[PDB]
Amino acid sequence: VPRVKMNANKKRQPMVNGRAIINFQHLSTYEPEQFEVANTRSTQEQFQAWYEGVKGDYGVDDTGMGILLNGLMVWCIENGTSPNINGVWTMMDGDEQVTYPIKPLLDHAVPTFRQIMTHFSDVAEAYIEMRNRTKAYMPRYGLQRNLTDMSLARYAFDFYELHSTTPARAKEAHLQMKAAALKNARNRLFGLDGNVSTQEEDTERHTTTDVTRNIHNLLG
RNA sequence: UUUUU
């Protein structure tokens, strides 16, 4: 008495013209990563374009970017990846402090800069645990949110990506800090258009006329 | 979706 193996498909199906459109053979093997089909982060083409833009502006090569990306990621952990950031971002070269401009780093991000840094969310999460083994390390973003749980330091930056299995109680904490940080976020599409209104005067000026025009139909 | 500095 062998054991039968069950496999179910079809059932309802779209059936646009009497036959199914879904390729169930391909659907069985089509199991991509959740972050590869999410619209909350930049695509591979957009991320690749951003990478070359930073190279052409800073002038460093591939090995230089590897060092810079580590410093930039740490800076983005402490300081949020807001589109309004300006000035320079700093990294420690052993003992001295070196600064790099922020403006060229924001120009080549086709989507918002937070989507670009979302690609570093998995690496950034591992960085916090590496720091939180012998010392209490809390990112400045988590300090500004008044998060009193040091165990939930893995999730203390604004470019963190939610996962199906990685967070269990951190989902509630991460969303609460997002709501607190976005309590007074204005959303205006337009504002201060480039037109200055005013008007245009098209009238000839002659010595025989007055400041504006001649006087007619006036008696006295 | 964005908006978290």
Cα A199 from Cα A171, distance rounded (Å): 56
- Residues A159 and A76: beta-carbon distance below 8 Å: yes
Tell me the nt nearest to A112, Cα to C1'.
B2
Closest residue (CA to C1') to nucleotide B2 in the complex: A112
Task: Please tell me the distance from the alpha carbon of residue A52 to that of residue A29, in angstroms, as a whole number.
Answer: 34
Its domain, for residue A168, covers: 44-180
Asked whether residue A209 is assigned to any structural domain, the reply reads no
Separation in Å: B3 C1' and A205 CA: 54
Residues A100, A87 contacting (CB under 8 angstroms)? no
Whether A137 maps to a domain, the answer reads: yes
Protein residues with Cβ atoms closer than 7 angstroms to any atom of nucleic acid strand B: A 39-40, 79-85, 111-115, 140-141, 144, 158, 177-178, 181-182, 185, 187
In a domain? residue A17: no
Domain total for chain A?
A: 1
DSSP 8-state secondary structure symbol assigned to residue A91? E
- A147 inside domain: yes
Residues A144 and A162: beta-carbon distance below 8 Å: no
Q: How many Å apart are A132 CA and B1 C1'? A: 34
- Residue labelled with tokens 């930073």: A54
CA of A63 to C1' of B1 (A): 35
Q: Determine, yes or no, domain membership for A134.
A: yes
Is A140 among the domain residues?
yes
Task: Please name the residues in contact with A95: beta carbons below 8 A apart, sequence gap of 6 or more.
Answer: none
The size of chain A, in residues, is 220
What six digits make up the tokens of A11?
């059932």
Nearest nt to A42, CA vs C1'? B1
Distance CA A81 to C1' B3 in A: 12
Residue A170 is assigned to a structural domain of this protein: yes
* CA atoms lying within 13 Å on the CB side of residue A201: 4
CA–chain centroid gap for A12, Å, is: 39
Cα gap A44→A72, rounded to integer Å: 19
Residue A36 covered by a domain: no
